[PDB]
Symmetry: C2
Subunit: 245 residues, 2 copies
């Protein structure tokens, strides 16, 4: 895998003349500074404050190399996990890997990181993944609403039907809202399945009939009969016959 | 962004003769068996049991196609993710995404998932990433020892120096261990840097003198002088003059 300390490693692989200079500077420093500042790679052998200087230089290098994930992975070593998550979020660089580490700072920090990751995924055109993350933090209704408002009706219903009681109004509204849109666009057969899902079978027969063809009228008539809307069934059946003349 | 329910989506986009049969089967099923079983795509519109059958089928399709991350989301939707985490650990198929969602099953399930994930990452020879996840559950000594025992001395030292007190014996052993290996391999100048890190300047001078050339003997003598080991410095400085004859 890729090294998290490439600049300092490269500095440590220089000529013996540079290594000899390093030993002297290092011996001087450990024996109770501009030399040390120049030779930042000595942070590995000096003190924590010079180590952190070295790490910050390597982190800057990872950003200038288009590798923000290594920057964040490296800053985790220094310990400010919340600070790492804050700047990762501000930069739109949250990842599953960083969210997976968020519970080290407490449940509350993970909650915030999951929600921030979900916002970021919406901006990255990954609504379904974002909804799944909202589910992980028990925000079932928010996940459903996110998918509904972005026209992922299929997935919203699946989640809603999996987690809510069958009679929950949110579930019924998903069926109706999807059916409505389908009807407007002319997908009458699919809209009818939707209204059936919402336990509005009368409207389901009607919408199938809006197509106007004989096949749709027949099935609409037979649908009404199954449900006990015999009067509607008779009228649709008569319309079916009229279309075949 | 692959769709999570492609098989049932395809079934829902067949000929409208097929969708008309869908409507009749669906109307019958909600107004209350073989058609119910055959047309599993109706699970989105029927009841939870049929929905779960449908989701299981879709997940099976994801696993065979090589998209287990889509199967993981479907299982989440089901709410058995916690069971699916146990199966992933047994098979060593955990992912960053699964750990990021694990706290949904409880804080200690995440703790267990991180430990299983780090164990898996070691088998996949991703030792530095494994150490990062051990840090996330505050197992610093374990992370440092893992890196050391797999010869990631540089990373081991950086993490230990960042998290442990300067006088922690673990940090000293790291320098001495790395220096020991470097010396055995003939990298005397690097080993001397490690011995300086462990506050063993006397041994640093000596090891740097093992190279034998005038430059190494010289810098070693100057190193002993900087530390106040002037007796050693004189000995090495005169060995340097003998070499320059
Ligand atoms: K909890």
């Amino acid at each position: 895998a890729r090294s998290l300390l490439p600049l300092s490693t490269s500095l440590d692989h220089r000529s013996k003349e540079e290594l000899h200079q390093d030993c002297l500077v290092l011996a001087t420093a450990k024996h109770s500074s501009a030399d040390v500042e120049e030779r930042f790679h000595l942070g590995l052998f000096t003190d924590r404050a010079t180590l952190y200087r070295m790490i910050d230089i390597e982190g800057k290098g990872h950003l200038e190399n288009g590798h923000p994930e290594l920057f964040h992975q490296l800053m985790l070593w220094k310990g400010d996990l919340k600070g790492v998550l804050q700047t990762a979020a501000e930069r739109g660089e949250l990842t599953d890997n960083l969210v997976a580490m968020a519970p080290a700072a407490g449940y509350h920090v993970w909650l915030w990181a999951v929600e921030a990751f979900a916002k970021q995924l919406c901006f990255q055109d990954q609504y379904v993944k974002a909804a799944s993350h909202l589910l992980s933090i028990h925000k079932v209704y928010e996940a459903v609403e996110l998918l509904k408002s972005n026209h992922f009706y299929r997935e919203a219903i699946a989640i809603a039907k999996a987690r809510l009681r069958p009679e929950d109004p949110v579930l019924k509204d998903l069926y109706l809202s999807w059916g409505t849109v389908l009807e407007r666009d002319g997908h009458y057969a699919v809209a009818a399945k939707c209204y059936l899902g919402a336990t509005c079978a009368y409207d389901a027969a009607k919408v199938l009939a809006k197509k106007g063809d004989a096949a749709s009228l027949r099935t609409a008539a037979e649908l009404a009969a199954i449900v006990g809307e015999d009067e509607l069934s008779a009228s649709l059946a008569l319309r079916c016959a009229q279309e075949l003349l």
